[PDB]
C-alpha cells in the first residue's frame, strides 16, 4: 500500500467539525503535532474567501490554516503566517457519535506519507482510530507514526490547553 | 464614574459567543490584546469542570483561559499556562444581530480599570461599541484605552489570523 492509495473519505460539513471542538491528537507522524489541540473555526464575516480555519494549538503556540475543498475529497490549506500550501485527505471520519468524535487525516508526498493527524475528543477510544493508524503505518514512511501524548507538559487548571 | 460602577451586563449563553467566532478586538487597554482574535470554545468532553474556554490569539501566540460564572454577572478566568485568576464583566453585549456581534468587557482593580477588550465581527460598526468605549475611558486609568488595530502585521492569505 502507498499513500496515494489510502482512502479519501467524505468530508463532513464544517459545522460537524466545529461541534466536535475541542479535539486532541492521538497519533501523529513528526514531533510537530504532539501534545496538540485542534479547534475548527467558521469563516470570518469579513473573509472574502469564506474559508473556515483549522487551529493547531501546542501550549502557547498556534498554527492556523484557512482551508477550502479541492478534488477527490481533498482539503487545501493555507498556513496563515507563511502562506504555505498543504493538501490533506481523511482516512475516515466518525463525528458526533454517542462516544464523541474521531477522525484520521493524512498528507502525502506522492507514494510516501509526510504528516499524519488522528484526532478525537474521547481519548482515542473509537476502535476505528487504532485500526486506521495500523493501516497508515503500512505506507512508505508510515513507520514514523506514533502516540502523540506520551510526555505532555503539566496542566494548570484547564483540560485542552496548557 | 469608577470601574466598580460600570454596568455588569447579562452574559449570553456560551453558544451565542461560539456562534460569533471569530471576533477581533477593536479597543483594548494595554498593548497585550492589540491585533488579537478571540475564539470561544465549548468545554472538552473530558473536562471535569465543564468550563468553556476563551482564546486570545495574536499571530502565532495564544493565551487560553477556562472560565466559569461568578456573582453579579462575573466571569472567573483561569489562564491555562500559569493558573492565574482574573475576574471580568461585560459592559454590554449585542450578539447575533443582522450586522453581526459585538461586546465590550473589562477587568477592574477596585475603582480603576486594568484591562479592556471590545470585540466584534463587524469591524467596530455597532454604534453601542464606540459609545461603550467612551464611557469606559472616563473611569480611573481608562485614559489608556485605544484602538487595537493601528499597526497589525501583514496577512498571508487568511483573514482572522496572521
Ligand atoms: C516532495 O518531495 C520532493 C522531492 O522529490 C520535493 O521536491 C518536495 O519539496 C516535497 N514536497 C513536500 C511538500 O514535502
Ligand atoms: C487516556 O488514555 C490513556 C491510555 O492510552 C491513559 O493513560 C489515560 O488514563 C486516559 N485518560 C483518561 C482521562 O481516561
Ligand atoms: C491590585 O492593586 C493592588 C495594589 O493595592 C495589588 O496588590 C494587586 O496585585 C493588584 N491586582 C491586580 C490583579 O492587578
Ligand atoms: C475597518 O475599519 C477601519 C476604520 O476604523 C478601516 O480602516 C478599514 O477599511 C475597515 N475595514 C474594512 C474591511 O472595511
Q: What whole-number distance in Å separates Cα of residue A29 and Cα of residue A134?
A: 13
Domain range annotation of chain A: 1-162
Contacts of B112 (CB under 8 A, 6+ apart): B2, B3, B139, B140, B141
- For residue B57, the SS3 value is strand
Q: What is the DSSP letter of B129?
A: H
Report the C-alpha gap between B35 and B42 in whole angstroms: 24
Q: A60 with B61: CB under 8 angstroms?
A: yes
Whole-number Å distance between alpha carbons of B55 and B41: 8
Q: What are phi and psi of B75, to 5 degrees?
A: -115, 125
Q: How far apart are CA A118 and CA B6, in angstroms?
A: 46
Tell whether B61 is within 8 A of chain A (Cβ). Answer: yes
Any B CB within 8 A of A159 CB: yes
Ligand 4: residue whose CA is nearest its atom 11: B123
List all residues of chain B from 119 to 138 with a beta carbon under 8 Å from chain A.
121-123
Those residues with Cβ within 8 angstroms of residue B13's Cβ, 6 or more apart along the chain or in another chain:
none
SS (H, E, C) chain A: CCHHHCCCCCCCCHHHHHCCCCEEEEEECCCCCCCCEEEEECCCCCCCCCCCEEEEEECCEEEEEEEEEECCCEEEEEECCCCCEEEEEEEEEEEEECCEEEEEEEEEECCEEEEEEEEECCCCCCHHHHHHHHHHCCCCCHHHCEECCCCCCCCCCCCCCC
Q: How was this structure determined?
A: X-ray
Q: Which three cell numbers stand for residue B143?
A: 485614559
In angstroms, rounded to a whole number, what is the distance separating the alpha carbons of residues B16 and A162? 25
Taking the CA of A85 as reference, the closest ligand is: 1
Distance between CA atoms of residues B34 and B148, nearest Å: 4
Q: Is the torsion defined by CA of B95, B97, B99, B100 positive or negative?
A: positive
Amino acid at each position: 500500500l502507498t499513500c496515494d492509495q489510502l482512502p479519501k473519505a467524505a468530508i463532513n460539513p464544517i459545522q460537524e467539525f466545529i461541534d466536535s471542538n475541542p479535539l486532541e491528537f492521538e497519533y501523529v507522524l513528526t514531533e510537530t503535532f504532539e501534545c496538540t489541540t485542534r479547534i475548527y473555526v467558521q469563516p470570518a464575516r469579513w473573509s472574502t474567501t469564506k474559508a473556515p480555519t483549522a487551529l493547531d494549538i501546542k501550549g502557547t503556540q498556534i498554527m492556523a490554516y484557512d482551508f477550502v475543498g479541492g478534488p477527490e475529497n481533498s482539503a487545501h490549506l493555507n498556513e496563515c503566517h507563511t502562506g504555505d500550501k498543504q493538501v490533506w485527505y481523511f482516512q475516515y471520519t466518525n463525528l458526533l457519535t454517542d462516544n464523541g468524535s474521531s477522525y484520521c487525516a493524512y498528507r502525502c508526498n506522492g507514494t510516501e506519507i509526510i504528516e499524519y493527524k488522528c484526532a478525537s475528543n474521547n481519548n482515542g477510544t473509537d476502535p476505528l482510530q487504532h485500526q486506521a493508524m495500523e493501516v497508515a503505518k503500512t505506507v512508505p514512511n508510515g513507520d514514523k507514526i506514533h502516540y502523540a501524548k506520551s510526555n505532555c507538559p503539566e496542566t494548570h487548571g484547564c483540560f485542552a490547553f496548557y
